[PDB]
Design an enzyme around this catalytic site. Sequence first.
Site, PDB file in Angstrom:
ATOM      1  N   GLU A   1       0.791  -1.234   0.000  1.00 60.28           N
ATOM      2  CA  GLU A   1       0.000   0.000   0.000  1.00 60.28           C
ATOM      3  C   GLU A   1       0.828   1.291   0.000  1.00 60.28           C
ATOM      4  O   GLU A   1       2.008   1.306   0.352  1.00 60.28           O
ATOM      5  CB  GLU A   1      -0.915   0.024   1.231  1.00 60.28           C
ATOM      6  CG  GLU A   1      -2.107  -0.922   1.170  1.00 60.28           C
ATOM      7  CD  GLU A   1      -2.237  -1.800   2.411  1.00 60.28           C
ATOM      8  OE1 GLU A   1      -2.339  -1.226   3.517  1.00 60.28           O
ATOM      9  OE2 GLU A   1      -2.243  -3.055   2.272  1.00 60.28           O
TER      10      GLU A   1
ATOM     11  N   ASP B   1       8.367  11.852  -5.612  1.00 66.75           N
ATOM     12  CA  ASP B   1       8.331  10.976  -4.404  1.00 66.75           C
ATOM     13  C   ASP B   1       9.278   9.773  -4.450  1.00 66.75           C
ATOM     14  O   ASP B   1       8.881   8.623  -4.215  1.00 66.75           O
ATOM     15  CB  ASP B   1       6.888  10.538  -4.074  1.00 66.75           C
ATOM     16  CG  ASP B   1       6.585  10.564  -2.534  1.00 66.75           C
ATOM     17  OD1 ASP B   1       7.369  11.146  -1.729  1.00 66.75           O
ATOM     18  OD2 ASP B   1       5.573  10.026  -2.040  1.00 66.75           O
TER      19      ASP B   1
END
Length: 274
Positions: free
Chosen positions: A12, A118
Amino acid sequence: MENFQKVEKIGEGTYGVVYKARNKLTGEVVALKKIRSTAIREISLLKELNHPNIVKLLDVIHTENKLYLVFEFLHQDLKKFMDASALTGIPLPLIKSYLFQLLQGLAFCHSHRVLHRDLKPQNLLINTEGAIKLADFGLVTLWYRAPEILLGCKYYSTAVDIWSLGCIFAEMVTRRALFPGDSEIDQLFRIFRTLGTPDEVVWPGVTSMPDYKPSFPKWARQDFSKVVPPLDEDGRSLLSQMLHYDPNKRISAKAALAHPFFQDVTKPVPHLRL
Ligand SMILES: CC(C)c1cnc(Nc2ccc(S(N)(=O)=O)cc2)s1
């Protein structure tokens, strides 16, 4: 989506949940990312951005306001490889190979005016043949965030991806995170304690940024000989240029490919247990 059967949950992130899945028409094994306008447009321009060091986006499937991204599958991420390599450490010729390949990927994306934003070990994926690839580009962890973002700048540059990759290079070498901050202010002060508190001498314009405060404590710089000890002088020199405070002085991906650290670069194979 009726074409795909879920095999297992991989993991996740902030945006979504990832599954290993099988295509019933091609027989193929893929990765499936589930999320609950301009967005569609920009994600669809990534279908056209193809390079051997970027994880391929195969398709975008928009059904009932749920969005599904279909990717090529690799067998391990860099966070799991580092954890399993913890008592021995990753060999130096493999660290140097992985850094060179990631700088090739970045030089490609940055020439098409695309930023990752990111970068962290969970977004870097490896295979049995010695390759490493950039994964799951952005349109949670603070540990790899550049100082211009934390000081409030809105129109930051390709230079933020170089800062992140430098933080990752240091982590492979020492087997510990370089700057493991636990809030926004703690992240910033962890950088300042190591590299020194920035001022107008090292970064022209810094005191005019939105979140800069004259009351920041004033800490002195430390030597890179203490920050990444087992690294040779060529590697220390390159890391220092990837972590310059001023983003206009920070080394570009294309320039870094020419540094003398990569004079003797090779492509070794890892030992993986799948
Ligand atoms: C979503 C996309 C970018 C991915 C493609 N292939 C994936 N595979 C993958 C495999 C193993 C592991 S892990 N944590 O090492 O067991 C993590 C991710 S994710």
